[PDB]
Amino acid sequence: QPMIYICGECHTENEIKSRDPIRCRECGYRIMYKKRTKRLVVFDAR
Amino acid sequence: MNAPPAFESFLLFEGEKKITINKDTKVPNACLFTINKEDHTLGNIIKSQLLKDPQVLFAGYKVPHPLEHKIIIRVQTTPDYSPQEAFTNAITDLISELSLLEERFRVAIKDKQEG
Amino acid sequence: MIIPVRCFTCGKIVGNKWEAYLGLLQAEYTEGDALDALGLKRYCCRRMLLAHVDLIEKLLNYAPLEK
Amino acid sequence: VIFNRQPTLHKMSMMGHRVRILPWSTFRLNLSVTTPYNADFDGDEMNLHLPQSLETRAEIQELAMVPRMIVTPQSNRPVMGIVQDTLTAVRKFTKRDVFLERGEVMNLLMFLSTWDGKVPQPAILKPRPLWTGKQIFSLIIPGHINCIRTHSTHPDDEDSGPYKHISPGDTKVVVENGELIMGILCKKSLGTSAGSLVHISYLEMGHDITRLFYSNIQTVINNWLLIEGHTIGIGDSIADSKTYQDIQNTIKKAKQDVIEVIEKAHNNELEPTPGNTLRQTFENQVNRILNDARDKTGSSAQKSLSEYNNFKSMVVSGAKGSKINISQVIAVVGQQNVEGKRIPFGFKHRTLPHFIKDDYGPESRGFVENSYLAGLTPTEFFFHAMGGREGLIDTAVKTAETGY
Amino acid sequence: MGKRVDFSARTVITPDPNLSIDQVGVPRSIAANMTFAEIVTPFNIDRLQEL
Amino acid sequence: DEITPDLWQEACWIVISSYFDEKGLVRQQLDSFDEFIQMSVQRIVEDAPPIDLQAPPRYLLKFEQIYLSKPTHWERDGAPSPMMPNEARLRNLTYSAPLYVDITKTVIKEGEEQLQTQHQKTFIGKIPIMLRSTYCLLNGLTDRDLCELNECPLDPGGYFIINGSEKVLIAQEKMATNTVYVFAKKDSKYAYTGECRSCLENSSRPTSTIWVSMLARGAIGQRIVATLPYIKQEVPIIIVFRALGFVSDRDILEHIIYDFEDPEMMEMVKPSLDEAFVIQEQNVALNFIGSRGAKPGVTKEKRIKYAKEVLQKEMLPHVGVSDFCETKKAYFLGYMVHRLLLAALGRRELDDRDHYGNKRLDLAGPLLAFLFRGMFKNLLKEVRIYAQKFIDRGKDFNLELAIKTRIISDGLKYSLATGNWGDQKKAHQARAGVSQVLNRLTFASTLSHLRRLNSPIGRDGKLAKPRQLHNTLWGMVCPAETPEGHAVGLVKNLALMAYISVGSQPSPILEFLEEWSMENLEEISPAAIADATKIFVNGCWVGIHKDPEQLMNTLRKLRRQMDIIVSEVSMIRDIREREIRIYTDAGRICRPLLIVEKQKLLLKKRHIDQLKEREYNNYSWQDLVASGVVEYIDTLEEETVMLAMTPDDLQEKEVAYCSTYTHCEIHPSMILGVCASIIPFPDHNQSPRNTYQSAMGKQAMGVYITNFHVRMDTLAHVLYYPQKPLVTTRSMEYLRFRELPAGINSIVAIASYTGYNQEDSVIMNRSAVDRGFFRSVFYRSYKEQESKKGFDQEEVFEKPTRETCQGMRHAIYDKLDDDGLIAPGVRVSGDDVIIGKTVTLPRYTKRDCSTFLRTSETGIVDQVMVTLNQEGYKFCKIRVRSVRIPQIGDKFASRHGQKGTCGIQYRQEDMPFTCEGITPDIIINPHAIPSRMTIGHLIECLQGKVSANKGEIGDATPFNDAVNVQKISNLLSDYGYHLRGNEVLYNGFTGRKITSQIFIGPTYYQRLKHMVDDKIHSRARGPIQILNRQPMEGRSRDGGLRFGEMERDCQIAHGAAQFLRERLFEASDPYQVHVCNLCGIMAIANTRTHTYECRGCRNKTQISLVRMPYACKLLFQELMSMSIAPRMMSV
Amino acid sequence: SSVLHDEFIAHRLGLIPLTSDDIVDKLQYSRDCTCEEFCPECSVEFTLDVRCNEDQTRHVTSRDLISNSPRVIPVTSRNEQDDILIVKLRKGQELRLRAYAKKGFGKEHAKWNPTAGVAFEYDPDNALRHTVYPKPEEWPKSEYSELDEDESQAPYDPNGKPERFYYNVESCGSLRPETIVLSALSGLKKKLSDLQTQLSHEIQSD
RNA sequence: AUCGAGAGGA
Ligand SMILES: [Mg+2]
Ligand SMILES: [Zn+2]
Ligand SMILES: [Zn+2]
Ligand SMILES: [Zn+2]
Ligand SMILES: [Zn+2]
C-alpha cells in the first residue's frame, strides 16, 4: 500500500500516494526510483 | 528460447531405454546397439575394446548428431560368437581394466606420498 | 567489468589474482614476471590477467541509489 | 517445407526440404545445399514456408524437393556440389598415400548410409592391413557409374607421353563400376561442373541415390578430416629466402624497366602504336611490364609452395581461393586500378602529396610491390583502399540495374 | 503479385554436416508455432487423438 | 637537437598524444557549436533589418545584443533551476538554454518628440545546447564532478538532448562557395561552363549560383553566355559588362584579357563581341537584361530598375552587394570568363567535382545558423504583424506579447528531433538525415557517429564518381570506414587528426595586405594584371601583387607565429596560374603536419622533451603549433605541399627523390578513422575486410559508456567481461578502447573440426561460455505516461481489475503494484504486464491500456523510474534486464572482417586440445582466410600468442617496420612454441593426434548485436492488416513473411501452381464476393436472409459467388473509385 | 545494491570452487533425493551478507561465503593465495544472498569441472607418425621426449601402437588431483557397470 | 495503431 520511492538525488526513502506530483519531500527532486521487490527470485548460478 | 537443459545430455527421459539392441539384417551376426544419453566417452572405449576381440569382425560407433545425445555401436562377430556376448565381454574387460588401474593408481599415490 | 573467476579456456581460478597482480605491478615487476609469480603458465590464464580492464573501479565512482 | 533465401534469383533458391526438429534456434542446412541458395553462415536468415494441404505437399514433394533440384536446366550441370571442408578433405583423402587402419576404416564405414555391411578387402594385406582412401570412396560412389576426369594439377603433357594410364601424380580420375580406380578427387570431379561424378550419378542413378551420395561423401569425409585435420596459418603465407630474393629481383627489374620506358617517353624516343595515342601506348607498355612482373612473381611464389601448404591445399581442391590470392599473400599484391586505369592524378599532376609532379612510376601510380604478409606501405594502403572501394561500389550499384 | 503469408518462419541459418541435403533442421519453437491441418480418418484417429 | 630515427617512433606518438590531450575526438562538433553561439547568433540578430512600422507615430525595434544563459528548466511553479543533462535524458526534457535579446524601441511621432525604451534581456527563444560545449553545465568539470552528476568522464559530448533523445548533427558536404569552377558537361548545349556559387560573408540569403558558359560548336564561332540568377534566359557576357557601365569593347577585354599579346584568347572572345554590337550603352543593356528576365516589364523604366537590382544584389554577392561595386563585379566576371577561356583553350585543367579542396563540411554551427536565420526571420515577421494590428489602432503595444517565442524554440527542437532540416511546414522540401539519434551501442559507434560526414548526393544516384575514394581524402577521411550497403562512399568518417575549420573573418588579413605592398583592384590599371599575381581572399579577388614568393613567405611566417593569421587559414599559391587564394571560411577539412626546414624537421628534441612533461610545465599541443613546428594544411593547400611520409624520407639518398620537402606526416596511421584505428595490422588485410570491420566494430558489444547503470536507453548491450586486446594499435590509446573495450581475447584455432564451422561459421567452447565467455546483458527500457489531456478521457497508472476494465487481456496483472507499476527484481516473461494503465471511458468507465513486454523476451525488471515530463503528468521508465548467453546462431567477428555465426558449441572434453591441455575458445574454418586474404588475422593471432607468453601488449600499428612476421616468429620460438603459431592438437573425441598441426592462438573477437533470439520468428494465422486483410509486417507485429514477386516467379518456374495459389491466395487473404452475372460488378449479398441482388441490373437471381483475394477485391474497388469498371464475367 | 546485476553475482558465485573431497561421495543428486527442493543430504547452504559502511572499497570475496557445512567451504577460504573476489562495494552498497550448492559434473556446467587444465600427451617423439611435421626440425621437443638434440623425431615405428600416455591433471581446488583421478576411474567404471546392467536386462528381455 | 524518416543485416 505505501509504495515508498527513493530520490534520485538525495536517496531518501519517502512515501508517495497516487494522484500526487512526483516530488521528493527532502530536496524536491523530480526523479524517483522504486525499491527492490520483496518477492523471491531464484537464480541458477550458470 | 530453444536451449535444452544441460542435464538432457546425461539423464534418461521417462520411458526411454538406456540401450536398445537391433539385429542388423544386411550381414549375419551383426547388431546395432543404440545407447541413449552417452557420448564418445563410452563409445570409443567400447569400440576399441571390441576391436581387441579376434571373434569381432566389425566394431564401430557413431554419434549420429552432436545435438542429440545417443550413440550407435555396430558390432559384427564370427558365426560361433554373438555381438551381444562380444559387447558384454568388452564391458567386463573394460571394468576389470579400470579396477586394476584404480588399484594401481592408489598404490602409486601411496608410494608417492610416503616415499 | 570485474576480474573473471575462472580462466575461460582451462577453468583455472584467476579471480583471486587480480589484486595480487596489481600489487606486483606497483612493486616494479614486469607484467610477464608478475604473471609468472602468480603461477599463470598457460598463455590462456596470462591472457585473462594481462587483458583485463577493471571497469568496476570506474562504476564505483558513482554514488549508489540508496544511502 | 519450402526453404527460401532472398534474393530468389532462380528456381533453386526455393527448394523442398524434410523437417528435422533439433534443439537450438537456427535453421540448420546441409553444406552442399548452400551454393544453390548462395547462402553462407555469416548471419544469413532464410524463410521456411509450410504447405497447408496434401495437394501442395505432394506438389512440393514431387517437383521442388532438393534431390530433384540437383541438376539445373540453366546450364545442364549440377547446381550443388561438394564444398569447402569436404572438398579439401576429399582431395587429401584420395591422394595416393592415404592409408587407413582397420579401426579408422570401421569408424568411417559407420557413417556410410548406403553400406552393404561388407568390409572390403584391404588394398595392402601385408605387412599390415591398410585400406586406401580411394578404396573407401569407392564404397561411397553409388551404383556402377563410370567417369573420367582430371585433377586440377594434371600436367597437360602427360596424356601424350607414356604413363597415360598410370599417372605419376595420381591425376586423371578414373571411376569404373562405381570404384575409384585412380585419381585425386577435387572440384573438377565433385563440384558443380558438367560431367562430374555428382552429375553422372544424377544422370545414371536417380535423384535419391545422388542425395545419398552427397550425404555419404560429406559424413565420411568430415569424420576422416577429424583424423587428418585441415588448417591455415602464418607458415602457409611464408616463403623461403630464395623465393623472396627471386621476387624482389623480379620487382626491381620491373621497376627499372618502367623507368626505362619513362625515360624513353620523356626523351620522345617512344613512338605510338597503331590505334592508340602516345599516352595510351606508354600506359600499355608500363601496364604490360608490371603485369609481367606480377605474373612472374606469382609463379615464383607458386613454385615455392610445398605439398603441405594449406593455401595450396585449398586452391588445389578448388574449395576456396585461387593462385592469384596466393601470389598476393606471398609475392606481391600488384597494380591497383580505378576504372580500369592506374591510380588517377587526384591532386594536381599527383596521386598523393608524397610524390613529385608528373611521376608515372609504378609506386606513384598504385603498384603495390609488397605482399599481404609483408604489409602495405601507407601509399600502397591508400591506393589499395581505392581499388577495393571500386569493387564495393560495383557490388552495391550493379544490384539495382541487374534486378530491374 | 507479392504478399505476406501465414505459416511462414524466418531465422538465422547454421551449418549442419549431419543433415542430408534434402533435410532442414528446424527449432522446436518454430515447429511448435507452425501447424499443419491433418484430416482425421480411422487410419490416424488414434494418433491425432493423442496429439 | 635533431630527433634521431631510434627515438622517432616515441617522439611522433608523443606528439600525437599531445594533440589528443588538447583537442579530443569531437573537437569539430564543439568548436562549430561554440562559434555558432559566440558569433553566428549575434551576427544573425544584428544582420536582420530594423522593422520600421507606422500608421503618425513610428517604431523601429532594433535588436542589439544577445544573452544566452546556462541551461535551465522551468517547473509548473515556474522556478528556474539548473538542469543537468542526465535529468534531461531521464525526464525527456530538452537540454536547452534560454536566449534573451536586448530590444530598443524609440518613439518618433513629430516635433523631435523622441524617447528610447530599452527592454533588456527580452526572452527571444530557447536554443538546445551541445553537451560539453562552453555553454554546457558539464563544461570544465573534472571527472569527479562528472561522476557526481552521473555522467561518464569518457563521454565525448558533441550531441544534443532533445526530448531525452541524444541527437547528433552529421556534417554535410557541399561545394565550396565564392570559387569559380569550370566543368564540361558531355550532354549539354554548352561546351564549357564556369559556375560560381556566390554567398556573402555573413550569410543572409541562399547561394546565388552564376554560370558563364560557352555554347557548343554547332553560329560562326563559339559564343559566351551568362546564366544570371532570377533570369530564365541566357545573356551574352558583353551585355552584362555593358549593363555594369563598361560599354567600350576595349574596357571589357581589358577586364577579361589581361595579356593583349595573346590572339588566341582574343579570337575566342570575338564571337561574343560580334553578337553584342546593337546594344552599346548601359541603359539599353539593362533593358535587354530585364526583357530576357521572367518578369518583363511593359515599360523599359522598371525593366532597367529590375536589371540594376539583380546585377547589384543577386549577381556575385561575395564580390560586394553595395553600390559603386560594379568595378569589382566586372573584374570578377571577367575573371570567370578568363577561366572559361583558359579551360576552352586547354591552358587550364577542368576542375574536379570530387576534389575535397573544392568542398566544405557544413557542421553543427553553420547548420544551426541556417535554421536560426530562417526562424529569426519568421519571428520578426510575426512581430511585424502583431505590432501592425496594434499601431493601426493608434496605440502602444507590448513587445513581450508580440514575441511568440515558440518559433525559435519549437523550430530548433523539431529540426533536431526529426532530422528534417528546414521549416516544419516544408516537410518535403526539407532534407532529412541531418541530426540522427546518437548510436550508443558501443563506444566506437558513438565516437564514429560523432565524427560522421555525409555526402548528400542521394543514395538513388548510381554514378560511382562521388562514391569513389578520391585521392584528396588522404589524411582527411578514413579510407576504410564506410557503409557497405546503398551508401558506399557517400557516408564518410573523419581521420583521427582531421580538423574541420570553424571559420574566421578575413579583416586582419585584408588589412595587412593593404599595409603590405598589395594593390587594390579598383586602384590598378588592367595592364598591370598581366605579370602580377592575383590575390583572392575567401573567393573575392581583392588585389594584385608583384612578388608572390616573398608574400607567401611573409604570410606563412605570420601564420606560424600565431600573428594576425590564425592557424586554420589556408593560403594556397598556385604558381603556373598566378593566383594566391587565401581561405578563412568554415568547413575546410585540414590536418596537422610537421613543417620541414631545408631538409630537416623543425620538431627538435627539445619539443619532445617539453611534451614528455606535458602534465607539469603545461607545454601542450598549442605551444607546438605556436612554435611554428606544426601547421594545419587543408586539402587545397596540400596540392602545393611536398610531404615526407616519415623523417627517413628527409635523409640524403643515393638517388634523391625530392630533396625539397616542405612538411612531414606525424604518422601515416592517422589516415584511418576511429573504427579503422582498432584493426590490428590493417595493411596486411584486403581493404574490403578493413571496411567490413570498420562497420562491424560498431555492432560489437562492450561497455558503451561507464554510466550505463543510470541511463534508460531503449536498447543497450553490456558485455560481462570486456577485455582490452592483447594485440593493439597505438591509436586506441586515444579512442579509449582500452578503458571501454568491445571484445574478448579468445584462444582461436583455425581448423576443420567436425564441419560445424564451414562457410563463415565458428565452433565455440561450451565450457568457456559456461565460465562467462562472451556473456552479455541486454537492457530494454519501456516508457509510458498517463495523459490527462482533457476531462473527456484521462489515463492513470493503477493495477487494473477484471470488473471495471474492458480491453483487459487474459494475462495476469499480479506482478503490478497498487501504483500500477511492476517492481524491480520481478522476473517477467513474454506478454507480461509491467505498467497497468487504465483510460476513463466516455468493463465500465475505464478501459485497459496497459504496457506489455515486447513478446518473447523473458528478462528481469532492472529498475523503475518515475518522474514528470515537460508538461507535468506522471511519467514512467522501466528497464528490464535479460542475460544473453552466446548460443548457436549468435554472430561473432574478429577485427578483420571475419564474421560468422556459432555453428555448434562443444564442451571442453569435446574440443581439440594441445599437449598442455589448452582448448580453443573458438574454432574458425581455414577456408575463411584464402579468398579473403585477411593475413592480419593470422599475424594478430601470432603476435597475441607472443604477447600472452611474454606479458605485454602487441604493437599492431599499421605501418611499423620494427614489427614484421619474422621477428614475431623468432620471439614465439623463444617460448617453446612452433615459430609460426602451429601446435599439435589432439582429437577431443578420441584423443588421437590430428595429423595436421593446427594454427592456434589468442585473437580479439567481438560479439555483435545480432543475436539469433532477436531474429527468430514464426507465424501461423496471426493478426492481419486493416486495409488489405493480409498478415502484418514484422516480428514485433507478429507479422507474416513476404512471398514476393521473385518468389512468385520462382514457383512459376517450378510449375507449382497449387503451392503458388496457397501462398498468394489461401495463406494471405482468402475472400469471397458476390458478382452479378450480367454486369459483372460486385453485388449485395445477405446470407442471413439469403437475398442477393444487384442494384445496377435490378436482378436478384443471377448472382454468383467468387473466391478471390481480398487485395484483388480492394484493387477492383479502388478502380471503381477511379470510374473504371472491372467486370468479373463468370461466363 | 552493487554495480553488478543479480545474474552476474549468481554466475560468479557458481564458479567459486568448494572443497568437495569427502562430501561429494556422500551427497546425493537432488534428482535422487526424496526431499523437497533442498535438504542437507543433497545440498549445502551458503550465506553471504556484506555491507560497505566504511569509506574504502569493500572487497566481497569468497571468504564472505559462510557455509552451514564445515567440510564444504570455498577453496581459497580453506586454511598465500588470496580469496576469490565476488564484487567490490562502495560505501552504502550492500549484498545479501543465500546460496545452495549441489552435486554435478562438467557435462552439465563447467562450474562442476574440477580441473584447471588436463595436459594429455602420448608418443612425445613422433614415432607412430600420428602427426606429420612438414619441417620436423622446426618443432620444439616435448618435456617427455628422449631424443638427442640433433634428432628431431623418432624413427617411424610401423608396428607401434599408442602406449605410455602422460597426464598432468591440475585441480581447480575442489578435489585433490589424485582424488580427481580416482573419482574419474570410479565414475567411468560405474558408467560401464550401469551400461552392463541395462545390457543384461535388454538381452534377457529378448 | 498509422505515416514518414533514419540506422542497420544478408
Ligand atoms: Mg551471408
Ligand atoms: Zn530528494
Ligand atoms: Zn587458463
Ligand atoms: Zn448487375
Ligand atoms: Zn535433498
Side-chain angles (χ1 to χ4, degrees), chain D residues 47-79:
Chain D
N47 312 318
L48 176 144
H49 301 272
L50 178 60
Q52 293 289 302
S53 72
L54 281 161
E55 293 180 354
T56 55
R57 181 182 275 260
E59 190 151 316
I60 300 307
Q61 182 170 346
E62 303 293 314
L63 301 175
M65 207 51 53
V66 167
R68 315 235 181 197
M69 293 297 102
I70 278 161
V71 171
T72 185
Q74 154 170 350
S75 51
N76 64 46
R77 64 188 173 72
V79 69

Side-chain angles (χ1 to χ4, degrees), chain C residues 7-12 42-48, chain F residues 918, chain G residues 116:
Chain C
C7 172
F8 299 133
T9 297
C10 58
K12 189 191 174 65
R42 289 187 284 284
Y43 64 89
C44 59
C45 318
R46 301 174 77 80
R47 171 274 312 270
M48 294 290 292
Chain F
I918 286 170

Side-chain angles (χ1 to χ4, degrees), chain F residues 157-439:
Chain F
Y159 56 94
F160 305 89
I161 297 160
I162 296 90
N163 304 333
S165 195
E166 292 175 324
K167 301 279 157 60
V168 54
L169 287 173
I170 312 306
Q172 305 291 318
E173 277 173 19
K174 68 193 183 69
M175 278 306 264
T177 53
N178 312 343
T179 311
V180 187
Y181 295 140
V182 184
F183 301 125
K185 189 163 178 289
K186 65 213 183 299
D187 52 328
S188 68
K189 66 184 288 184
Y190 311 104
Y192 295 89
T193 182
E195 73 185 5
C196 175
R197 292 180 179 90
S198 184
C199 166
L200 193 58
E201 193 70 12
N202 303 321
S203 173
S204 314
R205 313 152 296 284
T207 47
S208 56
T209 318
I210 175 166
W211 293 269
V212 181
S213 310
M214 273 183 75
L215 270 288
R217 185 171 291 284
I220 302 107
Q222 295 201 269
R223 185 177 65 247
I224 309 167
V225 298
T227 308
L228 288 180
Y230 294 179
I231 287 154
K232 295 296 192 79
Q233 270 153 42
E234 61 85 20
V235 181
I237 51 159
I238 309 310
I239 301 299
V240 182
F241 269 88
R242 295 219 172 89
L244 291 178
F246 297 95
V247 299
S248 168
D249 303 335
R250 185 180 295 275
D251 302 336
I252 305 177
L253 308 182
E254 287 287 330
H255 284 231
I256 293 160
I257 290 148
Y258 315 123
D259 197 5
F260 293 95
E261 311 307 326
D262 186 74
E264 296 65 19
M265 285 274 286
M266 293 270 198
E267 61 86 20
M268 185 179 288
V269 56
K270 217 179 289 204
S272 297
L273 290 170
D274 292 9
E275 192 270 344
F277 67 97
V278 302
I279 297 169
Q280 268 278 349
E281 51 270 21
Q282 181 172 357
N283 290 318
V284 173
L286 284 149
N287 167 70
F288 185 86
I289 289 156
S291 309
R292 301 284 289 173
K295 285 90 190 175
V298 297
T299 183
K300 300 184 177 178
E301 206 283 310
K302 70 197 185 195
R303 284 184 182 170
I304 287 160
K305 295 296 294 297
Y306 183 61
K308 182 64 70 177
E309 202 74 14
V310 175
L311 261 60
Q312 178 169 350
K313 288 300 169 144
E314 301 293 328
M315 183 177 176
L316 300 164
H318 80 279
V319 177
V321 288
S322 173
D323 50 51
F324 313 140
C325 76
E326 303 179 340
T327 304
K328 289 144 56 168
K329 285 208 179 57
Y331 267 114
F332 193 86
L333 187 73
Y335 170 79
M336 297 199 59
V337 175
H338 185 83
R339 283 286 307 285
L340 194 70
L341 296 187
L342 288 174
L345 288 155
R347 301 182 162 153
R348 270 191 82 144
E349 293 82 3
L350 294 174
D351 283 306
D352 195 334
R353 186 97 47 171
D354 303 310
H355 203 283
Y356 263 55
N358 298 332
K359 282 165 164 283
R360 298 287 182 280
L361 277 297
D362 208 13
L363 267 166
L367 280 174
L368 287 162
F370 171 72
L371 263 53
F372 196 82
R373 291 189 296 272
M375 293 179 184
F376 196 74
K377 199 175 78 165
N378 287 113
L379 181 64
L380 292 193
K381 191 217 286 194
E382 292 278 67
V383 175
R384 269 214 310 282
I385 296 89
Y386 182 89
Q388 190 74 351
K389 57 154 62 168
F390 276 34
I391 61 170
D392 284 5
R393 294 188 284 188
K395 47 173 173 179
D396 205 75
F397 63 98
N398 202 31
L399 78 173
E400 277 80 41
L401 271 285
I403 286 157
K404 53 177 71 66
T405 58
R406 294 328 293 191
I407 319 295
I408 289 164
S409 294
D410 292 358
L412 292 175
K413 202 190 293 190
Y414 160 81
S415 199
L416 297 169
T418 52
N420 300 322
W421 207 249
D423 208 36
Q424 182 166 3
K425 195 202 194 184
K426 303 178 75 173
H428 52 98
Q429 299 194 27
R431 54 189 172 86
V434 194
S435 193
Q436 302 175 3
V437 184
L438 185 69
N439 209 352

Side-chain angles (χ1 to χ4, degrees), chain F residues 700-973:
Chain F
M701 269 166 252
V703 184
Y704 62 102
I705 204 70
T706 311
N707 66 324
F708 67 89
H709 74 120
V710 67
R711 299 173 57 89
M712 288 282 207
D713 297 325
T714 302
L715 303 173
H717 305 261
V718 175
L719 209 69
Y720 269 33
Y721 297 123
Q723 281 184 2
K724 55 167 150 177
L726 293 164
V727 182
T728 198
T729 71
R730 292 170 95 130
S731 294
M732 324 187 191
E733 197 66 25
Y734 324 116
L735 317 179
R736 319 297 265 288
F737 202 91
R738 172 167 305 236
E739 293 82 3
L740 293 171
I744 293 165
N745 295 277
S746 313
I747 310 308
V748 71
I750 312 178
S752 293
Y753 197 75
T754 70
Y756 273 95
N757 51 358
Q758 305 188 52
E759 275 284 18
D760 309 319
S761 181
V762 309
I763 296 156
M764 293 177 71
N765 197 332
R766 182 57 168 284
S767 290
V769 163
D770 293 344
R771 291 151 192 162
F773 182 63
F774 276 126
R775 199 174 290 201
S776 63
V777 58
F778 173 55
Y779 288 110
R780 200 189 275 279
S781 298
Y782 301 84
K783 65 179 73 174
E784 193 53 82
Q785 53 184 21
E786 64 195 22
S787 59
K788 320 296 195 74
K789 64 180 284 297
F791 63 91
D792 190 2
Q793 296 192 351
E794 47 161 32
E795 300 172 328
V796 65
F797 297 151
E798 57 187 354
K799 190 158 170 165
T801 55
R802 297 285 183 178
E803 57 265 21
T804 62
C805 284
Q806 188 260 333
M808 174 154 207
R809 293 197 206 167
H810 269 277
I812 196 73
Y813 292 63
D814 70 332
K815 281 166 198 163
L816 312 180
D817 305 0
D818 53 337
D819 60 31
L821 307 176
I822 202 160
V826 174
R827 194 186 286 284
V828 285
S829 46
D831 198 88
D832 207 325
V833 182
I834 51 164
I835 297 169
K837 182 175 73 175
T838 63
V839 67
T840 46
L841 285 165
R843 55 177 78 178
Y844 300 85
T845 193
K846 61 192 290 189
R847 184 184 68 169
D848 183 74
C849 194
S850 295
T851 302
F852 302 82
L853 266 191
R854 204 174 300 281
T855 53
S856 188
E857 280 284 334
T858 318
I860 282 160
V861 182
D862 191 67
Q863 59 174 322
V864 180
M865 185 219 74
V866 301
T867 189
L868 308 166
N869 54 4
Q870 275 282 18
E871 53 78 26
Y873 306 140
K874 185 177 180 180
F875 176 47
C876 191
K877 282 187 201 280
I878 299 182
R879 197 166 73 209
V880 174
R881 154 165 54 78
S882 179
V883 170
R884 297 289 179 83
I885 292 163
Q887 64 193 33
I888 292 176
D890 282 7
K891 207 206 264 178
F892 299 80
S894 80
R895 293 178 285 171
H896 310 278
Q898 289 299 326
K899 48 170 169 177
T901 62
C902 183
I904 208 174
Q905 277 165 347
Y906 288 125
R907 294 183 290 276
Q908 188 189 338
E909 80 286 0
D910 281 325
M911 290 283 265
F913 55 105
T914 72
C915 60
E916 50 176 0
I918 286 170
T919 57
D921 289 295
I922 292 160
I923 312 177
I924 66 166
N925 199 236
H927 296 86
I929 314 311
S931 52
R932 272 74 172 285
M933 321 189 265
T934 48
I935 310 315
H937 189 300
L938 310 178
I939 304 164
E940 190 217 344
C941 185
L942 193 73
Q943 177 77 96
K945 206 177 228 184
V946 174
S947 300
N949 282 280
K950 180 168 185 301
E952 63 164 10
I953 300 296
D955 193 14
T957 314
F959 323 107
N960 190 10
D961 296 332
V963 169
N964 54 299
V965 162
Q966 198 65 51
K967 292 199 204 316
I968 303 160
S969 301
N970 293 333
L971 285 160
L972 190 54
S973 66

Side-chain angles (χ1 to χ4, degrees), chain B residues 10 14 28 43 55 61 74 81 91 96 110-111:
Chain B
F10 182 76
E14 268 182 39
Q55 303 196 266
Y61 84 107
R74 182 179 189 279
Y81 204 48
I91 291 159
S96 86
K110 186 180 289 293
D111 291 331

